[PDB]
Design a protein around this ligand. Structure first.
Ligand SMILES: [Mg+2]
Lengths: 154, 134
């Protein structure tokens, strides 16, 4: 079986720590169960079917976008801050997912990813569930939580 | 210190075409290149737009940075298309995907070098100038 749990945890933690440079992105307790706000979705294709989903509240989304662009964004409803917020978070998703599938030439398959999707002002993105789910919360210095989820399709 | 983005045979900045579906990444690369003296001749958010713009500026593009995962047209398909149009094109792949064989396949298809994300100014710059030897 494709052993993705460790590769996933390593990719998620590794990328966040390398991109957001704020001392202490703490890995929470991985759990089978869950998380409005925003959500980034990167589909996993090829031999495995699934997806990588990153969710956080609006405040956290602005905080993260602010740190990554080295400039303050405090109005997610501003028409161009919203543009950069979306583009920044989806790119974080793209990098986590890419590094993840890359550490997979540890298997005799092929693991592809799709362009990312940004779902904000969302319904607690019901991306429902009938396949291996794993939610991993990462805490930023303040109360801000970024949850990285991977659902492979057994 | 001789900004690297300047062609010292004319004093004119080298032209860079940035291709990535993320405006965040386009902005990061833009800062990196301009701070070093390069001129961003144009940018594209997908492989189709990249091909059009590359042909539009063609003789004048000195280097192309190319992402892989993108809507409408991915960077691997884009790479082959640009190399088909212009055998002398200089493309550097810059992507979140880094499987080692993918790297070799892009080089085989014509890319000069490859850069794995997340980005840092220093690395990008060192890679960009290696495709500048004679
Ligand atoms: Mg991309």
């Amino acid at each position: 079986r494709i052993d993705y749990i460790e590769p996933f945890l390593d990719a998620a933690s590794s990328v966040l720590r390398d991109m957001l440079l704020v001392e202490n992105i703490e890995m929470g307790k991985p759990g089978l169960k869950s998380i409005k706000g925003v959500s980034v979705i990167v589909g996993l294709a090829g031999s495995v079917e699934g997806s990588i989903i990153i969710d956080m509240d609006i405040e956290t989304a602005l905080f993260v976008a602010s740190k990554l662009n080295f400039e303050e964004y405090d109005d997610f409803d501003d028409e161009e801050t919203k543009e950069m917020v979306a583009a920044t978070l989806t790119e974080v998703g793209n990098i986590i997912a890419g590094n993840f599938v890359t550490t997979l030439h540890a298997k005799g398959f092929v693991f592809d990813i799709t362009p990312p999707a940004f779902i904000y002002g969302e319904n607690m993105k019901i991306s429902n569930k009938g396949s291996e789910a794993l939610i991993v919360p990462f805490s930023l210095p303040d109360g801000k939580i970024i949850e990285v989820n991977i659902a492979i399709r057994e | 210190s001789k900004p690297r983005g300047i062609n010292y045979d004319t004093g004119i900045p080298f032209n860079v075409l940035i291709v990535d579906d993320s405006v965040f990444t386009v902005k990061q690369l833009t800062q990196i290149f301009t701070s070093e003296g390069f001129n961003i001749i144009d940018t594209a958010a997908d492989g189709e737009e990249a091909v059009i713009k590359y042909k539009n500026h063609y003789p004048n593009i000195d280097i192309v940075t190319l992402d892989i995962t993108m809507p409408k047209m991915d960077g691997i398909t884009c790479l082959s298309n640009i190399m088909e149009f212009d055998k002398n094109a200089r493309v550097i792949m810059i992507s979140a995907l880094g499987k080692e064989q993918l790297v070799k396949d892009c080089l085989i298809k014509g890319a000069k070098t490859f850069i794995v994300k997340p980005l840092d100014r220093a690395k990008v710059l060192q890679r960009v100038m290696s495709v500048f030897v004679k």
